[PDB]
Amino acid sequence: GKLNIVTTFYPVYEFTKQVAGDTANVELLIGAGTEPHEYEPSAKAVAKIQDADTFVYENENMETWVPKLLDTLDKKKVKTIKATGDMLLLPGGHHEFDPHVWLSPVRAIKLVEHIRDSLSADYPDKKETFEKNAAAYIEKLQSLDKAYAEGLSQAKQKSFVTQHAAFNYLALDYGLKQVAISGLSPDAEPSAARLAELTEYVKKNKIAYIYFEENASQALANTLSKEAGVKTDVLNPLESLTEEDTKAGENYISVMEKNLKALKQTTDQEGPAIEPEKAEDTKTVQNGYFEDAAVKDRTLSDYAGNWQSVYPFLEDGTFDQVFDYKAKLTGKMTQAEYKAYYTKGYQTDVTKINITDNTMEFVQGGQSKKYTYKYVGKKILTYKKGNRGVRFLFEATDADAGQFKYVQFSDHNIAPVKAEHFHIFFGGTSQETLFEEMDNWPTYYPDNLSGQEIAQEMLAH
Ligand SMILES: [Cl-]
Ligand SMILES: [Zn+2]
Ligand SMILES: [Zn+2]
Hints:
Its main location: membrane. It is a lipid-anchor. By secondary structure, this protein is an alpha/beta fold. The protein folds into 3 domains: 3-148, Rossmann fold, CATH 3.40.50; 149-268, Nitrogenase molybdenum iron protein domain (Rossmann fold); 292-457, Beta Barrel (Lipocalin), CATH 2.40.128. The protein contains 15 helices and 16 strands. The strands form 4 sheets. Strands 9-10-11-12-13-14-15-16 form an 8-stranded antiparallel barrel. The protein has a 4-stranded parallel beta sheet with strand order 2-1-3-4, sandwiched between helices. Helix 1 (10-20) crosses helix 4 (105-122), helix 5 packs parallel to helix 10 and helix 12 (320-330) packs across helix 13 (335-346). The radius of gyration is 26 Å and the shape is globular. It starts with a strand and ends with a helix. Bound molecules: chloride ion and zinc ion (2 copies). Residues 412, 421, 423 line the site of one zinc ion.
């Protein structure tokens, strides 16, 4: 009969139904009346998932209860699908990363593609149906992407204030700037103190709208207008669709069309950029802001382990999303320019480095050269930005060390601690010549990681 597919919340349900069509009965586990971020599965819910043919969830950074279920699910017959597939995430403002990729139409295409791919692998006899259904829905998503680009590319004012911070990927992919606001709910009146803070914030930044995940209550809208001097509207994160909206034919695409209209009320109006209510402090040791007194000698054992070059994962495309993000975050280089920059940086024929308390072993061409190393000191460099970094210096004790005679590690630390990754400068001339090297910095992560894991780790912090 039809596949019994259990999905978690609304966009996972919709995207899965679009791909599976009449091959499946697709169930929505989290009903519209429950906020998906707050959902916790009951024993009955877990049973329903365990007994399904296929279970689809969006991402462990959204359905934070899914990781604990997978250890047992992996032993049951149900085939699981993580909708985001190999999509890399950025940190949010428990879970490490912001899951809200489906509010970017171009990313929604990638989730639909991945659901197609996984269902096609899981049920090969239906692959032509999945592929056909997916392609037709992707056509509609492509038109949505075009509407987004056309409606946002000429934005005069790129920043928008949202009570639900679901729109950072939309912002990155279409040239806007999400400004999340805290301590607000569509159905609740703020405290006197919070309202005063909001009134000052609106005035300081000339904020025209506060956007909410659903319509603000009549009372809250009135209060924000008469006391805080700001209008309200809806930026719907498409996490829930009411039965009323379902029966009126609303869906992901129509919600996103409404979101575009709502955004443009802000983005097509002149005005100053809106600052976050509380400012960031990026001046940290790992970002290169530290005091001389905290810089300490280190031993080779901080770097002990087995380490793999990241260069093959640039070459094979695994890091293409990293360079896409960098371009969208800074605007300073294009994606291709960033990839070229990191090609020069990562290029090396040293595929692996094994490090002990006293030795380093360098693998080139499937053969290894191993030397004993002594610590020789450290060097604090200052960069254009005004931040600094510490190189920790080692020298091989073998006459035959060649290009590995001199070795310097950079790992964003300044004192004893186990490295999580490093950039390594090595040569056979002197330490001083390596201090001037700024273009090539072969980069290593633990051998126990996949390239995909390295790529996601690069975006963390
Ligand atoms: Cl780095
Ligand atoms: Zn959300
Ligand atoms: Zn680094």
